[PDB]
């Protein structure tokens, strides 16, 4: 209940710390199923410096707004596009929703001209798509053509091509690093289909965008295509600094091929900004720029390939103990086949091991973020073996 | 451009500080038109403690999730509802969008049963509504019936009542503290109309919700109704800690009358959370709870009525200098009539005074947040007099 009298700073901080003590902490070897991790320590100072900024009012924070533009330019350069137009937004969800808004407004323009027989935008989406695409469908009344996945759990490119011939398609979604298994759709083929048919293509690289460009060749697999960025001519890319960019939440990224896409993000206010949010942090842009500058490609390569080394270690231990990984890992994600995954996950949770559950297959998914070290993997294998005894 | 080699912490921090130096700062007497201000200093420690939490994964942060529930309960108690269901979200925009989603899904349920002749939800919205309502309309394909405002710039209640008889209405929006003038719609009458016709009513108290409950009686005006909360039976209320709650961005609030509204926030994921965002900060809930506890009603009353004292001072000086305020202030907002407001605003901006421009009237709007002190108001009056000479 709200009280008349205030309390002391010592009282309220001690209470909050008690609540914090009930949380898990990334560095304690409990969290195995999350795509967030410890932030780069430098970002704590940056959050402090930029706490009292608001990119919803950029005319008041000219320098913080410039840092957002510079963060976007660095991400754009990483993705092979020196002219990208974009924003440092609240996360991959808002990023994906903005792309969907752009796809919808391109369709709206067509409908206004009689150039579309679709009463709602028709968008081809793989069934591996993150839940944010369902939030967008539900809110924006989109019509999704769900694309099946092949045996390697990547989108069926022939289905997409056939569907594009069969229907009037307003967008195609490809995923560069799926949530459950870390697989990479064949963006190169999808972008060829999209370009040939003049269809908008969005790449969801929320997770993979800050991993794929840094992978050592020994982790790359023959036959797997790792191309996903603006070198393929795609229209937009979601990329999430607060996942494998080690930035504090909220630090999401949305990049469009060029500034011509901005007009399709406009909103008509008859009695009255491209982001969905209004008031919004300025420290995400500052952190995204600073972390990429501080690390350079070299520093991020080191972190990414350390994670991959621990990922292949876990893969190795899993097989050595007769567990069946769903696939040989593509990114720093491994999943364990198990018909009894629901209950094994709950048994793991009761022993202090928190994994996530897949949807496209009966399995436990582990995300080997930088906080997962070899000793945590050893401890995980012991606890799981025991659960199975 | 992205570089191979990293840089030192000293290099990147000094660069960021240079960019920060180009920003305005709330405490420097430049910012007059914003509803954000300096955060309560205790929140810097809280942000640090809770930086590495994620309410998108509450199973991993049980204590931070409890603090969100406690923050919501304190806001609910402030709004006369000990059973409110809600969330500490990214801001008033996401809060308003979630309410609109709820209104739409109530309508969808009716449509599924043949109980609605509306092909889209029809929502009565005053023309003073914040831009976030237009974002919701554009994204969710809502049909708005724009309600006119009366001479006191509050919604025309008779129009709403007539419109509700004339049409099948799926929602009503009332504003408790408008963006441009700080006026309070007659929520009591609107809630009576809504209850009698079984129409969902949402109250946008993003700004007013943390001001109105704390106003000293000398600032209240005869004939103005200050009732706006769940004591009126309304369905939902937006309230923004990162405005007059002195909390860091992102700290927005959405409260529903009870937990029965949660099901209308569900999203059907055939191949797979009530917030729009996924990954999201945990420090907003911690800060909202802590600031309300630390201040108590007493501490917030002091800040609110200090602002009102400075608001009426500015009002007094304005008239003393023959400027025409749009209205006698209701909340800590005053606006200055001026046919030449566009250019006067730009002249003010070139002299370091940043105000905002109204849409419903030709005027400059000043928000007297806690960072505005008597000497800033004196300086503002001198600069404006000079601009007029």
Swiss-Prot record, chains A, B:
Reaction(s) catalysed by this chain's protein: L-tyrosine + H(+) = tyramine + CO2; L-aspartate + H(+) = beta-alanine + CO2
Residue(s) carrying N6-(pyridoxal phosphate)lysine: 243
Top-level class of the enzyme under EC nomenclature: lyase
Regulation of activity: Inhibited by hydroxylamine and O-methylhydroxylamine.
InterPro entries listed in its UniProt record: GrpII_AminoAcid_Decarb, MfnA, PyrdxlP-dep_de-COase, PyrdxlP-dep_Trfase, PyrdxlP-dep_Trfase_major, PyrdxlP-dep_Trfase_small
Single GO MF annotation: aspartate 1-decarboxylase activity
EC number: 4.1.1.11, 4.1.1.25
Pathway: Cofactor biosynthesis; methanofuran biosynthesis; Cofactor biosynthesis; coenzyme A biosynthesis
Subunit: Homodimer.
Function field: Catalyzes the decarboxylation of L-tyrosine to produce tyramine for methanofuran biosynthesis. Can also catalyze the decarboxylation of L-aspartate to produce beta-alanine for coenzyme A (CoA) biosynthesis.
Similarity annotation: Belongs to the group II decarboxylase family. MfnA subfamily.
Protein name as it appears in the record: L-tyrosine/L-aspartate decarboxylase
Protein species of origin: Methanocaldococcus jannaschii (strain ATCC 43067 / DSM 2661 / JAL-1 / JCM 10045 / NBRC 100440) (Methanococcus jannaschii)
Gene: mfnA
